[PDB]
Amino acid sequence: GSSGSSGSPLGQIQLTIRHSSQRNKLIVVVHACRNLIAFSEDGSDPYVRMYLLPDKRRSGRRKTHVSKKTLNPVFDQSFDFSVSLPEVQRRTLDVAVKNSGGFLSKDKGLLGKVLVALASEELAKGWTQWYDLTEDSGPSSG
Asked: Which of 21, 41, 52, 66 is the most exposed place for a label (fewest CB within 10 A)?
């Protein structure tokens, strides 16, 4: 280990995950994000991306609105996906918050991303917490 940054400079995000066994669906609410560094003070366009791993098909892509001229975007929206617990369990919810600044850049510019394990049993009830975004460097157990 090496001494470096102290805290979560990339940013964080709060998502309420709750999978009902009766409805066999996966509900995910995107309250809002904070501490989202901008590639340029001028203004960045932060946005949350939700993907049901492993499947990454570019068809079921479910994301929230893209706020402009702001670092702390707010959507407070709620999504849903018809998936049985048996599956969602061995699956993962790829949640990455990048900036849609495709203007004179030619890159996605990853600001921050965090993975969540839906292999929990306390999903029916649901929980709320701030997932501290981290760098790409990480295991992809899809």
From this structure: 41
